[PDB]
Scaffold this motif. Structure first.
Motif, PDB file in Angstrom:
ATOM      1  N   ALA A   1       9.091   4.004  -1.715  1.00  0.00           N
ATOM      2  CA  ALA A   1       7.729   4.389  -1.360  1.00  0.00           C
ATOM      3  C   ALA A   1       7.546   4.328   0.151  1.00  0.00           C
ATOM      4  CB  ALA A   1       6.704   3.494  -2.066  1.00  0.00           C
ATOM      5  N   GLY A   2       6.618   3.497   0.615  1.00  0.00           N
ATOM      6  CA  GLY A   2       6.476   3.264   2.040  1.00  0.00           C
ATOM      7  C   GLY A   2       5.132   3.691   2.587  1.00  0.00           C
ATOM      8  N   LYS A   3       4.191   3.970   1.693  1.00  0.00           N
ATOM      9  CA  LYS A   3       2.883   4.449   2.099  1.00  0.00           C
ATOM     10  C   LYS A   3       2.077   3.325   2.741  1.00  0.00           C
ATOM     11  CE  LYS A   3       2.723   6.615  -2.553  1.00  0.00           C
ATOM     12  NZ  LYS A   3       1.860   7.463  -3.435  1.00  0.00           N
ATOM     13  N   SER A   4       0.868   3.678   3.182  1.00  0.00           N
ATOM     14  CA  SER A   4      -0.158   2.713   3.557  1.00  0.00           C
ATOM     15  C   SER A   4       0.211   1.896   4.788  1.00  0.00           C
ATOM     16  CB  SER A   4      -0.455   1.777   2.386  1.00  0.00           C
ATOM     17  OG  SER A   4       0.644   0.919   2.129  1.00  0.00           O
ATOM     18  N   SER A   5       1.176   0.989   4.639  1.00  0.00           N
ATOM     19  CA  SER A   5       1.578   0.056   5.688  1.00  0.00           C
ATOM     20  C   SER A   5       1.779   0.735   7.036  1.00  0.00           C
ATOM     21  CB  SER A   5       2.871  -0.646   5.278  1.00  0.00           C
ATOM     22  OG  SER A   5       3.881   0.306   4.986  1.00  0.00           O
ATOM     23  N   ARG A  46      -4.644  -1.412  -0.085  1.00  0.00           N
ATOM     24  CA  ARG A  46      -4.113  -1.584   1.254  1.00  0.00           C
ATOM     25  C   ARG A  46      -5.183  -1.247   2.281  1.00  0.00           C
ATOM     26  NH1 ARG A  46       1.722  -1.662   0.994  1.00  0.00           N
ATOM     27  NH2 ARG A  46       1.593  -0.371  -0.893  1.00  0.00           N
ATOM     28  N   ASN A 138      11.495  -0.654   7.127  1.00  0.00           N
ATOM     29  CA  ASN A 138      10.628  -1.809   7.269  1.00  0.00           C
ATOM     30  C   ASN A 138      11.380  -3.081   6.879  1.00  0.00           C
ATOM     31  OD1 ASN A 138       7.437  -1.682   7.832  1.00  0.00           O
ATOM     32  ND2 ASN A 138       7.911  -3.522   6.647  1.00  0.00           N
ATOM     33  N   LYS A 139      10.676  -4.217   6.913  1.00  0.00           N
ATOM     34  CA  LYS A 139      11.171  -5.486   6.390  1.00  0.00           C
ATOM     35  C   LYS A 139      12.488  -5.912   7.027  1.00  0.00           C
ATOM     36  CE  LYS A 139       9.072  -4.321   1.927  1.00  0.00           C
ATOM     37  NZ  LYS A 139       9.329  -4.070   0.482  1.00  0.00           N
ATOM     38  N   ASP A 141      13.118  -8.725   7.965  1.00  0.00           N
ATOM     39  CA  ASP A 141      13.283 -10.142   7.684  1.00  0.00           C
ATOM     40  C   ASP A 141      14.675 -10.468   7.166  1.00  0.00           C
ATOM     41  OD1 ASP A 141      12.903  -8.650   5.474  1.00  0.00           O
ATOM     42  OD2 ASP A 141      11.232  -9.813   4.654  1.00  0.00           O
TER      43      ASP A 141
ATOM     44  N   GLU C 516       5.021 -15.262   1.476  1.00  0.00           N
ATOM     45  CA  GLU C 516       4.959 -13.847   1.141  1.00  0.00           C
ATOM     46  C   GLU C 516       5.142 -13.623  -0.354  1.00  0.00           C
ATOM     47  OE1 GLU C 516       4.066 -11.424   3.085  1.00  0.00           O
ATOM     48  OE2 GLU C 516       4.143 -10.094   1.340  1.00  0.00           O
TER      49      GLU C 516
HETATM   50  N1  LIG Z   1       7.861  -9.043   3.635  1.00  0.00           N
HETATM   51  C1  LIG Z   1       7.351  -7.821   3.910  1.00  0.00           C
HETATM   52  N2  LIG Z   1       6.717  -7.153   2.915  1.00  0.00           N
HETATM   53  C2  LIG Z   1       6.186  -5.932   3.134  1.00  0.00           C
HETATM   54  C3  LIG Z   1       6.308  -5.343   4.472  1.00  0.00           C
HETATM   55  N3  LIG Z   1       5.706  -4.144   4.424  1.00  0.00           N
HETATM   56  C4  LIG Z   1       5.243  -3.977   3.161  1.00  0.00           C
HETATM   57  N4  LIG Z   1       5.519  -5.047   2.398  1.00  0.00           N
HETATM   58  C5  LIG Z   1       5.164  -5.199   0.969  1.00  0.00           C
HETATM   59  O1  LIG Z   1       6.212  -4.687   0.146  1.00  0.00           O
HETATM   60  C6  LIG Z   1       5.652  -3.943  -0.933  1.00  0.00           C
HETATM   61  C7  LIG Z   1       6.580  -2.819  -1.362  1.00  0.00           C
HETATM   62  O2  LIG Z   1       5.972  -1.573  -1.036  1.00  0.00           O
HETATM   63  P1  LIG Z   1       6.749  -0.205  -1.354  1.00  0.00           P
HETATM   64  O3  LIG Z   1       6.521   0.241  -2.777  1.00  0.00           O
HETATM   65  O4  LIG Z   1       8.213  -0.414  -1.069  1.00  0.00           O
HETATM   66  O5  LIG Z   1       6.071   0.832  -0.334  1.00  0.00           O
HETATM   67  P2  LIG Z   1       4.481   0.742  -0.119  1.00  0.00           P
HETATM   68  O6  LIG Z   1       3.825   0.364  -1.424  1.00  0.00           O
HETATM   69  O7  LIG Z   1       3.930   2.062   0.353  1.00  0.00           O
HETATM   70  O8  LIG Z   1       4.193  -0.316   0.917  1.00  0.00           O
HETATM   71  C8  LIG Z   1       4.336  -3.400  -0.415  1.00  0.00           C
HETATM   72  O9  LIG Z   1       3.372  -3.389  -1.466  1.00  0.00           O
HETATM   73  C9  LIG Z   1       3.932  -4.358   0.684  1.00  0.00           C
HETATM   74  O10 LIG Z   1       2.873  -5.197   0.222  1.00  0.00           O
HETATM   75  C10 LIG Z   1       7.010  -6.134   5.499  1.00  0.00           C
HETATM   76  O11 LIG Z   1       7.144  -5.685   6.654  1.00  0.00           O
HETATM   77  N5  LIG Z   1       7.492  -7.331   5.153  1.00  0.00           N
END
Ligand SMILES: Nc1nc2c(ncn2[C@@H]2O[C@H](COP(=O)(O)OP(=O)(O)O)[C@@H](O)[C@H]2O)c(=O)[nH]1
Lengths: 159, 79, 636, 239, 159
Positions: A1-5, A46, A138-139, A141, C516
């Motif tokens: 995915a990757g939306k919103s953030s 979000r 992203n991420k 970490d 987290e």
């Molecule tokens: N630890 C961490 N979690 C994140 C980060 N960015 C987003 N998330 C969480 O990871 C979840 C996975 O989202 P995903 O389905 O992969 O894409 P999204 O739903 O568009 O953000 C999201 O719902 C975010 O709450 C990050 O930079 N670090």
């Protein structure tokens, strides 16, 4: 995915730099559960960065088992365009690895790939490589971020 | 999500042009909140939307019935 | 584990030492001289450590120290003397401290390494050398609604008393820091169950006429969200009053130089405490308005400014755990999580380029004891685990190494059903807290802040504490050290369990990683559900709820609460905000832009706040922080 | 073999223990001198004494165990089952004062807990009037539940042996033992327990110590909670 | 007083015995072996008491006597089993009875001569072997007035 953030950060940068001089219209698209027939359009949980009358948000579902989109995706895109708003931002739900349906109806496509993919050289067999504008991961970490970045850059250079 | 602004809630609902609004308010003091919701809804002709509440046993039957007569369809009791 | 391993090894060494010494002592009566034994003894002594050797040699001096009636120690330029003997009713003379009767060296070394006398390393059995005398410094808490009535009540209760200790509980609107406005939604619940404040003006008028410069006075306010912002407010008021004082005494604008001197002096001398915390709220309700890391970084910057300006007496850090147990957490889990949180704060402060020795003694802890046996030794572990960590791992000051705690009764155990039994069983809670060298004891009702205006019960609430500390006979002792096995055994077992839980937490991918992933919330939910299941099932019985009910039934006649506020008060506060807003329309914009620049450029946000608060609204500050992206998102 | 009323008059703890054990031993010797063998009656003697507020009570029962046991082994060589000594413990109503009687319910818990920690053979939680001259009522529920509270739910009650982790227990044990033995020596020098009963030595000792206690009480140098201070300005209607 | 004096004497004697034992044990590792120490050990053991020596020899049996979860004892014609482990809400396992962790025989001897586990000579810590279980015999004391009234009350109570 990757939306919103990433959309959240982009929207905040826009508002903070241009003093909210732009009118953004954003439409999200979500898949539908094939079994119960329902859906969960949970992407405006979000960023609260839509709190401005000059900026509009709308959520929609796939409605389809075959594609990721409704039958009127380009039509609704044009409808959003016709309002003389500053910019159109459209989310693109999720399928497996062979989907590129949004490109023929968009001018700019910002692509993002998840960090948790490993796949030392399976990005090659991944389809969407030379079909986008800018890579996104992203991420950070987790480790191996430098290695993944270098390999992505090398593959982009090759393609 | 939770702890979302009333103005934000109504504005987002007008953004998405939704059919119903669901609220769980077990904290109490819901009378002014729901009255503000109803007034703001009737301010801009969105009466097609439906309102249902849940707050446990906080509301006495007469009070919840009065609010219901004001226009909210129901409030779902726990018992 | 390495510390304990050294303990065991050196204990065996000491056993060997005394073995060989007494061996040769006996052998010399035989006449035949085999000197190799002396060589082995010298070798054993050389293999032994040094500091432990000094400690072992100190033992006869330790015995002769506490033999007499009064303890004397001449240090620096003074010499502190204190009586150590008390008289019973039957003429039996009781020592306040009792010393071991042992003679075998190994036990002596082990006990001196694990359980010293209080006031000594490693402070297992209490920080202070001896118990402080009577006249408890019990703060009296009262706060609700507007500043005028609160100040009225403060003057009402603080009258004719020297040692003044006030406690402030604001309203929820202040805790969320949202600017009140015409909307009845925010206007409705406002002012009830706390004191609502909006500007520096109202904050000052709240504390009007009270000498913030009095050394023997304390103010403690409970709020965590806007903890930075209001802090500046407090600081500014800490300035304002005193400056106005000389304005009355001098009648002229003070010079800039003397102004700076006055500010420096008052900052050095001012006192207070803000029970502020970040981790507990994020773990407990997700009702934070800011990002966790954002708030932690802001707190670190504030600590940086405080250390830079060098105030040695005021602290604003409160590592509490009350709400965790309030949900119903397990004791060991609670202790482990609190310790992990504290050490995480320590590491974060280490990360900001500040030396350890400047903040360690200003930390604190706040947690509750329940009915389980572990609480009876809980505080013991609390001292031990911290202590060792400060000695070898970082080597801070001895004064920095000491740990202080706060203990409050647990209202979850005191259920409204059969409220009478709760008061009696609270004595059981208080007894072990006193036994564990309590540093500060609260005996509060169910509501932490008297959500309803309480009654004669506070008398009872106070009385029990007095009953124990002033007149209970056994309480004149302080050191359960030899003569109660379960203390030591449970101590060792709980230490092992807490260390294993630390291992689990580390393995689950970092403290912020768990934050987290919501590991702790799930663990707490699971254990609380298990607790409630056992409760309604009775596999663990509980007195007075599932059994021994009254055949007459429980009508439970009572009333809910009486805490209102006049609409006129709200209207007056609203127009007060209106006037303060209309006063300085051009000014706030410049401070907002400067705040933008500073936050963007990685600088001291608290520095900009210290000037903005004089001219900027709290709600405007919150909205600016939102604009910079400080808002807490829904990341469930 | 009861001494409850001896403490009820206001006796000192050590004196109470000493007099009770003296009475018991006197009965033992009186039975012995009548040509009756030991092993027929020893396990049947029973004791009845209370625990007050002073710290010695927290260890008092312990001494009663020790002093008896040794005396029964070397001196007569009775059976072990005969040697073991049983005792009763009841709350001390003297500590409870009619004024602010609401506090007495709270302060009885400390008395109960020390008795329980001492592995009692029995416990009685009783109101002021032992016969309930005024017929007792609802409050007995409370007086019962607290005992229940201690014995069925409180976890530490699963302990029965505090013996490595509190020095005061052992130290006070030795001190109390020595004091009781000294009092025994004084009693013996007083010309037999029968002689003491004749000349009223114990009456005088008890009277003197009770007067001492009351002097300290009304003085306020030795505080007593809820009476010498902290009085309610609202008066004490206390119906 | 004589009993306490005997306690002191035998305690120091046991100290001497374990002293000589460990002394010869350490001497055996150096190569030189002068046997006078063993003679001293024999003399001390002869001077050592008898019943106390048996009690001290019982010590490893005591350690095993409380190792497990329950204990069983054979007596008369039967045997009795009873459990001794409790479990907290924390899962922290608690033994009903704890034993000293000393190793030097002097303290052990003093402890075995002064305060044993309840249910043993000299019953310092408690006469019963183990705490009697719940359901205590709560008596009902009542009586006032004539015999008939008391009989009626007694009939009323014990239904
Ligand atoms: N630890 C961490 N979690 C994140 C980060 N960015 C987003 N998330 C969480 O990871 C979840 C996975 O989202 P995903 O389905 O992969 O894409 P999204 O739903 O568009 O953000 C999201 O719902 C975010 O709450 C990050 O930079 N670090």
């Amino acid at each position: 995915a990757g939306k919103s953030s990433l959309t959240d950060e982009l929207i905040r940068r826009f508002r903070l730099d241009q003093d909210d001089a732009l009118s953004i219209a954003v439409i999200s698209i979500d898949p539908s559960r094939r079994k119960s027939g329902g859906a969960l359009l949970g992407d405006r949980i979000r960023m609260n960065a839509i709190n401005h009358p000059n900026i509009f948000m709308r959520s929609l579902a796939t409605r389809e088992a075959g594609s990721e989109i409704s039958q009127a995706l380009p039509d609704v895109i044009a409808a959003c365009k016709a309002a003389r708003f500053d910019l159109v931002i459209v989310e693109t739900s999720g399928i497996g690895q062979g989907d590129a349906a949004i490109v023929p109806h968009v001018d700019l496509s910002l692509y993002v790939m998840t960090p948790e993919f490993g796949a030392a050289s399976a990005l090659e067999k991944i389809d969407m490589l030379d079909f986008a504008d800018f890579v996104a991961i992203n991420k950070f970490d987790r480790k191996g971020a430098q290695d993944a970045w270098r390999d992505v850059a090398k593959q982009v250079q090759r393609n | 999500g939770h702890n979302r602004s009333v103005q934000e809630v109504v504005t987002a609902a007008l953004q998405e042009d939704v059919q119903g609004i669901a609220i769980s308010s077990y904290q109490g003091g819901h009378v002014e909140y729901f009255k503000y919701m109803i007034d703001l809804l009737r301010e801009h002709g969105g009466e097609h939307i439906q309102v249902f509440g849940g707050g446990g046993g906080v509301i006495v039957p007469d009070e919840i019935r009065e609010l219901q007569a004001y226009g909210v369809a129901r409030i779902y009791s726990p018992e | 584990r390495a510390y304990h391993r050294r303990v065991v090894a050196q204990s065996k060494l000491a056993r060997e030492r005394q073995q060989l010494r007494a061996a040769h002592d006996m052998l010399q009566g035989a006449g035949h001289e085999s000197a190799a034994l002396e060589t082995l003894a010298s070798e054993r002594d050389v293999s032994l450590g040094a500091v432990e050797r000094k400690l072992l040699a100190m033992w006869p001096q330790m015995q002769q120290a506490y033999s007499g009636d009064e303890y004397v120690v001449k240090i620096r330029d003074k010499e502190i003397r204190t009586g150590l003997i008390s008289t019973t009713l039957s003429g039996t003379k009781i020592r306040k401290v009792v010393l071991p009767r042992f003679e075998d060296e190994g036990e002596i070394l082990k006990w001196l390494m694990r359980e010293n006398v209080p006031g000594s390393f490693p402070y297992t059995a209490g920080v202070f050398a001896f118990k402080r005398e009577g006249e408890d410094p019990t703060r009296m808490f009262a706060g609700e609604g507007d500043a005028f009535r609160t100040n009225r009540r403060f003057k009402l209760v603080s009258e004719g008393m020297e040692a003044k200790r006030l406690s402030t509980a604001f309203d929820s609107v202040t805790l969320y820091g949202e600017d009140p406005h015409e909307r009845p939604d925010i206007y409705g619940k406002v002012g009830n169950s706390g004191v609502s404040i909006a500007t520096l003006e109202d904050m000052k008028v709240l504390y009007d006429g009270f000498d913030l410069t009095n050394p023997s006075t304390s103010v403690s306010m409970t709020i965590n969200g806007p903890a930075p912002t209001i802090l500046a407010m407090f600081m500014n008021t800490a300035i304002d009053q005193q400056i106005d004082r000389f304005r009355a005494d001098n009648g002229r604008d003070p010079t800039a130089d003397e102004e700076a001197k006055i500010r420096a002096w008052v900052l050095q001398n001012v006192r207070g405490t803000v029970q502020a915390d970040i981790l507990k709220e994020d773990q407990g309700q997700n009702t934070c308005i800011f990002s966790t890391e954002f708030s932690l970084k802001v707190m670190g910057d504030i600590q940086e400014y405080f250390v830079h300006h060098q105030v040695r007496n005021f602290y604003s850090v409160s590592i509490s755990g009350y709400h965790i147990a309030e949900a119903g957490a397990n004791p060991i889990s609670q202790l482990a999580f609190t310790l992990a949180n504290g050490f995480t704060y320590v590491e974060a402060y280490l990360a900001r380029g500040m030396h350890i020795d400047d903040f360690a003694p200003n930390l604190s802890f706040f947690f509750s004891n329940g009915m389980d046996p572990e609480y009876s030794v809980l505080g013991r572990v609390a001292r031990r685990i911290w202590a060792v960590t400060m000695r070898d791992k970082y080597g801070a000051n001895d004064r920095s190494q000491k740990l202080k705690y706060h203990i409050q009764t647990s209202g979850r155990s005191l259920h409204a059903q059969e409220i009478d039994f709760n008061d009696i069983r609270t004595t059981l809670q208080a007894l072990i807290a006193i036994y564990d060298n309590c540093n500060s004891l609260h005996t509060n009702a169910y509501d932490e802040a008297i959500t309803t205006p309480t009654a004669e019960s506070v008398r009872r609430a106070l009385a029990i504490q007095l009953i124990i500390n002033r007149e209970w006979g056994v309480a004149k002792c302080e050191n359960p050290n030899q003569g109660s096995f379960l203390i030591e055994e449970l101590t060792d077992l709980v230490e092992e369990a807490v260390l294993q839980e630390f291992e689990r937490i580390a393995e689950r991918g970092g403290v912020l990683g768990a934050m987290e992933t919501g590991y702790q919330r799930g663990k707490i939910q699971e254990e609380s559900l298990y607790y409630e299941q056992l409760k309604h099932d009775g596999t663990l019985p509980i007195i007075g709820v599932n059994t021994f009910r009254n055949p007459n039934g429980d009508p439970t006649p009572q009333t809910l609460e009486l805490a209102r506020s006049s609409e006129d008060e709200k209207q007056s506060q609203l127009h007060r905000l209106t006037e303060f807003h209309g006063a300085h329309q051009a000014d706030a914009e410049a401070m907002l832009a400067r705040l933008r620049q500073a936050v963007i450029d990685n600088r001291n946000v608290f520095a900009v706040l210290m000037d903005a608060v004089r001219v900027c609204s709290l709600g405007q500050i919150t909205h600016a922080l939102f604009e910079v992206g400080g808002q807490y998102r829904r990341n469930m």
